[model samples]
Target chain A: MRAVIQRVKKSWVEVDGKVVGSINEGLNVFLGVRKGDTEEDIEKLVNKILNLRIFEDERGKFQYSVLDIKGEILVVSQFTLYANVKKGRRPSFEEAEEPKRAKELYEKFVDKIKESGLKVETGIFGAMMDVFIENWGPVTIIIDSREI
Target chain B: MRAVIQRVKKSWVEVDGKVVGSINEGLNVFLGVRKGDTEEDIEKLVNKILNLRIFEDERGKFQYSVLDIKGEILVVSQFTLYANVKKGRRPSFEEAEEPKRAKELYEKFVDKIKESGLKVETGIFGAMMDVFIENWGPVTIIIDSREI
Candidate 1:
C-alpha cells in the first residue's frame, strides 16, 4: 500500500456529480494498493497515517498527530502510485493491483480507520471523483508500507 | 529530495496573513530536503515533475504532462518527508537537512521550475504558512529524487 497524506482544513469527495463523502479539519489521503499487497501493509499504513506527528504545536514544531488532535480523514483511491515513467513520456501502471483485490484491500483500510472512532469519509472505489481539499499548511507526506 | 505533488484547481500560500504565492489550475507541491540531497537530484526532479504524465485525457488515460496542460504551480516547504516515527510517538527530524542548506536547495528547485514560465507560486521558506489547495480528481503523486 502507498499513501499520500495531506493535512487539510476540510475536504469533500464528489462522484458522478454528487457528494459521497466529506470531512472537516483532518487528513486527505490518496491511497494506492500495489500488487501482492498484504493485510500487514494495510495495518502499517493506517497506523502510520494516523500517528505521524505532522500538525504543528504553538512553538512551530510538529508535536501533534491527527489522532492526538481528534482530526477527521477523507480517503480516496488512486492506483497511480505504482505508475512507472522511467522509460517514456507515457506512464505505465503495471504495478497496480487489479480492481477486485484492490477494492477489497481499500475497503479494509477504510474500515480500520473507522474503528478508531474519528469521523472518516471515503471516495467510492474506482470511481471518477472530484476531491476538494483545503490543505492547511500544505503539509503533505508519502508513506509506502513496503518501505516500513 | 522528496516531494508530494497534487493536481489542484487552485492553491495559495499566506505568510503574515498575506498571500505571498498563489496559482490557478495546476500542481501543488510539498517539498522536503533530505540530509544528503544534491544538485543532481534537483535537476532530475525538476525535469520529471514538469514533464511527467499525470493529468488524464478525455478518455481518462494519463496522456498529458503539466507543461502540455499549461498549468500553474504552488510549492510549499515540508521537511517532514524524512521524519522518523519508529521508536516513539514524537517524530525525530534527524534525517532532515538543516535549515541553511535546505532553503538553498529548495529555492533552486523553485527557480528551475520558474524558468519554464508556467506561473509558479511558493510559500515563504522556513516560515509558518497557511496554505489552501483545491485538489482536483484527488490526483496526487510522490516523487523521490533518491529513489530515482
Candidate 2:
C-alpha cells in the first residue's frame, strides 16, 4: 500500500458534479491499493495517519497530531497509483488490484481509520472524482507500508 | 487495502519549523496495508494512480490523471489509517502491521509506483512530520481492491 498524507485547512471530493465527501481543518489523505492486501495492511496505515503531528504548536513548532486538534480526514481512493508505463506511451494497469479485492480492503481500511477516534470523511469509491484541497502549511508525507 | 487520492496545489512538510518536503502541484496519496498485503497491492495502486484523469485537462475538464498532467505524488507512511479508538483515550493499534513487515510493503509500493512510469516524490517514513496542503479544484477519489 502507498499513501500521500497532507495537512489541510479544508478538503472535499466531488463525483460527477456532486460533492460526495469533504473535510474542514484536517488531513487530506490519498490512498492506493493492490492485490493481496489484508486487514493488517489497513491497520498499520490507519495508526500512522491519526497520530502524525504535522500541525504547529506554541512557538510555531510542529508538534500537534490530528488526534490533538480533533481534525477530520478526507480520504480518497486511487487504484491508478500503480500504473505501469515503462514499456509504452500508454500506461499499463495490470498491477492494480481486482475490484472485488480492492473494495474489501477499502472498507476494512475505513473502519480502522474511523476507529482512530477522529472524524473521517471520504470520496465515493470507483467514481470519477473532483477533489479540492486547501493545504495548511503545505505539509505532506509519503508512506509505503512495506517499508514500515 | 484502502487508499485516498488527493490533488494538491501547494503542499509542504516540516519539523520544528524546518521545511522537510514541499511541492507545487501534485497528487497526495495515503496508502494502508494489513497482514495480507503483497506485491500485487503495490502494483494495483500504482496502475490506478497513473491512469486517473482528475487533473486539469486540455478542455478545462478534470480529464488528466496525475500522470497525464505530469503531476508529482507525495507518498507518506501512515500506519494510523487503521487505528481503533472506540475503547479508550489511547487508540487501539491491533490492526496495524508490524513495522518490519509493513516497511517491506511500503518500499515495494514505492518501487511499484516509480516503475509505473510516473514522476514520484515522497517524505521520510516514521518521522514526526508537519504537513500542509493547498488543494486545487479538489479532484479526488477512494479505491479498494475488494470491490468493483
Candidate 3:
C-alpha cells in the first residue's frame, strides 16, 4: 500500500458538482493498494497516520500529533499511485490491487481510523472527484508499506 | 524539484468557484520546488514528462507519449512536497524554495513543456484551488530531480 498524507486547515471532496465530504481541519490522504497488500498494511498505515506529529504546540513548536489535536481526516482512493514505468514509456498499472479487494481494505482502513474518535470523511470509491485542500504549514508526507 | 504526474482523460482547476483552467485529455502535474533547485532540474523534468509514453496505441499497448497524442497538461504548485516531519510533530517547510524564485522556475518549466507543442494549463499559484482529474488507465508517476 502507498499513502500520501497532507496536513490541511480544511479539506473536501466534490462529485458531480455536489459536495460529498468535507472536514474543517485535518489530514487529506491519497491511498493506493497494491496487488499483494494485506490487512497488516492497512493496520500499520492507520496507526502511523493518526500518530504522526505534524501539528504545533503552544510554544509554536512542532509537538502535537493529529490524535493530540483531534484533527479530522479525508481519504481519497487513488489506484494510480501503483503505476510502474520502468520498462516502457507508458506507465503500467499491473501492480494495482483489484477493485474488489482494494475497496474492502480501504473501507477497513477508514473504519479503524474512525475508531480513533476523530472526524473522518471519505471520497466515493471509483468515482470522478474534485479534491480541495488548504494545506496547513504546507505539510505533506508519503509512506509505503513495502518500505516499512 | 519533485513532481507527481498523472495521466488524465480530462482535468480542470477551479478557484473562487470559477473554472480557471481546463483540459480535454492530458496530464495533471503537482509540482514542488525545493531549495537549491536549479534550471537544470526544470529542464530535465520537462523533457521527461513530455516524452514519457503513458498513452495507448492502436494495439492497446503503452506505446504513445503525450507528444504523440498531443495531450494537454495541468500544472499546480505544491510546495508541501518538501515537508519534513522526522524531528517533530509539526512538519517543517524549511526545504521549500522561496515563492519568488520557485514561481520563476515553475513558469519556465511550464513554458518548456508547452514548447513540445502540447497544450498546457495551470492552477493559480498560492491560491486555494479545486483540482478535478479523470485519470486515464489510472496511470501516475513520481519524478524527483535528484533521482533523475
Candidate 4:
C-alpha cells in the first residue's frame, strides 16, 4: 500500500453531492492499496503516520506528531497513485489492487487508525469523489508498505 | 531530493512578513534535499511531476497532466522531510543536506521547472516560511530522489 499523507487545517469529501466525511484540523491521507498487500501493510503504514513528528513547535522545530496535537484524520482511497506513466500518454493503474480487495484493506486502515480514539473520517469507498484539504505548510508525505 | 507534491486549487508562500510567491491554480511542492543528490535527480523528478497524468478529465477519469491543463506551480524548500525518527522521540536532520548546498540545488530545481514556461512561484530558500495550499482533490504525492 502507498499512502499520500498531508497536514491540514481542514478537509472534507463529498460523493454524488453529500458530505460523507470531514474534519476540521488534522491529517488528511490518500491511500492506494497495491496488489498482494495484506493486514501487516496496514499496521505498518498506520503506525508510522500516527507517530510521525511532522508538526512544528514554537521555535519552528520538528517536535510534534499529530497524535500529540490530538488531531483528526481523513483517509481517502485513491487508486490513481499507482498510475504507471512510464508506458504511455495515458497512465495505467494496473499496479493498484482491485476495488474489492482494495476497499477491504482501506477499511482495515480506517479501523486501525480509529483505535487511536481521535476523530477519523473517510470518503465513500469506490466512488468518484470531490475533496478538499487546506494543506498546512503544504506538508505531504508518502509511506509505502514495502519501504517501511 | 524528497518532494511533497499536491494538486492545488491555489498555493502561495510568505517569508518573514510578506508574500514572496503565489500561484492561483496548479501544483504546490515542498522539496527536501538530502546529503547525496544532484541536478540529474532534479531533472528526473521534475518531469515525473510535470508529466504525471494527475488531473481528471470531463469523464472524471485520470487523463490530463499538469502540462495538459496549463497549471501553475509553487515550489518551496522544506528540509524537514528528512527528519529521522527511528532513534527516539526527538527528530534528527542528519540525513538532510546542509543549508548552503541544499539551497543551491533548490534554486536549480526551481529554475529547471520554470523552463516548462508554467507560472512557477517559490518560497525563499532556507527561510522561515508560512505557506498555504488549497490542496485540490486533496491529491498529494511524495517523490524521493533515491526512490525514483
Q: Could you say which candidate leads in TM-score? A: 1
User: Per-candidate DockQ versus the true complex?
Assistant: 0.59, 0.11, 0.27, 0.36
Model 1: chain B TM-score relative to the native chain B: 0.95
List the RMSD of every prediction in angstroms: 1.9, 10.0, 4.8, 2.8
Q: Chain A TM-score of model 3 versus the true structure?
A: 0.93
lDDT of 2 by residue, B49-102 (tens): 677666665575545777777777777666655545343334445766788898
lDDT of 3 by residue, A1-148 (tens): 9888867777777776687889977788889999999989887678777777767756864567788989889888888778665455666689899999999989988888889998899988875576765655445677777754
Q: Rank the candidates by TM-score, best first.
A: 1, 4, 3, 2
* Number of the candidate with higher TM-score, 1 or 2: 1
lDDT (C-alpha) at residue A46 in model 3: 83
Proportion of native contacts present in model 2: 0.15
TM-score of each: 0.92, 0.55, 0.70, 0.85
lDDT of 3 at A112: 80
Error (Å) of candidate 2 at residue A19 is 1.5
* Residue ranges of candidate 1 with Cα displaced over 4 Å: none
For model 1, what is the error of residue B76's alpha carbon versus the real structure, in angstroms, after optimal superposition? Answer: 1.5
Judge candidate 1 against the unseen true structure and give its global Cα lDDT, from 0 to 1.
Answer: 0.83
Alpha-carbon runs more than 4 Å astray in model 4: A14-19, A87-89, B14-19, B83-92, B128-130
> Candidate 1 chain A, which ten residues in sequence have the lowest lDDT sum?
A133-142
lDDT of 3 at B17: 62
| Candidate 4 residue-wise lDDT at A123 | 89
